[PDB]
Amino acid sequence: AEVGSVIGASLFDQLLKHRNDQACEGKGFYSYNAFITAARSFAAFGTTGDSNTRKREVAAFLAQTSHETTGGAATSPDGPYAWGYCFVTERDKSNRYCDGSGPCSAGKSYYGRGPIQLTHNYNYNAAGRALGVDLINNPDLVARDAVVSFKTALWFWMTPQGNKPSCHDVITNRWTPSAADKAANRVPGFGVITNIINGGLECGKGPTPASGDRIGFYKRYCDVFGVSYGPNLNCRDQRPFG
């Protein structure tokens, strides 16, 4: 019925144990209330399929976003997979990521913000349009309004793009790979969700530390939820889309 039935406030804080560490950027930003309020705008998220598919979707979403925003390393307290949600903004702020063809508001930058590290004027444009907020003229809203921030990540998670299924359709088992997908080893599982998010840099050339970090988060979260991981966790041998 609602995502909170899968993940309560206590469990949210257990998984994202260190997000409000002094070393982290949020200083409260990524609240459970912002998360569940944002999730209400995407009713199917964490409420689709059986009870373990729902747990699995929340774990997959939180694992991917955790990697995007991780403050974790091998020697971190509680390990690398307890440091999700440490960052709100891209460390490098020198690139505006304007494509020169879509709208690009004077003095604004479209570097990574929020749980999925939303990047590029074209994505701020599309996300804002879907959410009913002007993220082209105020992209910083993604770093300042926590509900908006989680909404951009959920928007990304729930929305297909081109030949890419939505991450949602993958983790809920509603995606049937094409023949070319199958030849590329793009079969349903957490691995193809990594591929969707950053396959150009992370997939098709064997193990990478970044995809390994995504998987580490995911297995930790699944273990807490008491759910199996599902098949096809890695994208080592998946051709990037395209």
Q: What does the alpha-carbon distance between residue 191 and residue 236 come to, in Å, rounded to a whole number?
A: 8
Residue 141: exposure state from Cβ atoms within 10 A (0-12, 13-18, ≥19): buried
User: Which structure tokens are listed for 47?
Assistant: 């409420």
How many CB atoms neighbour CB 154 within 10 A?
26
Yes or no: say if 213 and 80 are a contact pair by the CB < 8 Å rule: yes
Q: What amino acid positions are annotated as catalytic residues? A: 68
- CATH number of this structure's domain 1-88+145-242, picked from the four choices 1.10.530.10, 3.40.120.10, 1.50.10.20, 2.30.40.10: 1.10.530.10
Q: How was this structure determined?
A: X-ray
**Header resolution in angstroms:** 1.5
Q: What is the DSSP string of the chain?
A: --GGGTS-HHHHHHHTTTTTSTTSS-TT-S-HHHHHHHHHTSTTTT-SSSHHHHHHHHHHHHHHHHHHT----TTSTT-GGG-TT--SB-S--S-----SSS---TT-----BTTTTB-SHHHHHHHHHHHTS-TTT-TTHHHH-HHHHHHHHHHHHH--BTTBPPHHHHHTT-----HHHHHTT--SSHHHHHHHHHHHHHSSSS--HHHHHHHHHHHHHHHHHT----S----TTPPPP-
Widest Cα–Cα separation across the chain = 49
CATH code given to domain 89-144:
3.30.20.10
> According to CATH, where is 3.30.20.10 located in the chain?
89-144
Span(s) in the chain for CATH 1.10.530.10: 1-88+145-242
Residues 6+ apart with CB under 8 A from 183: none
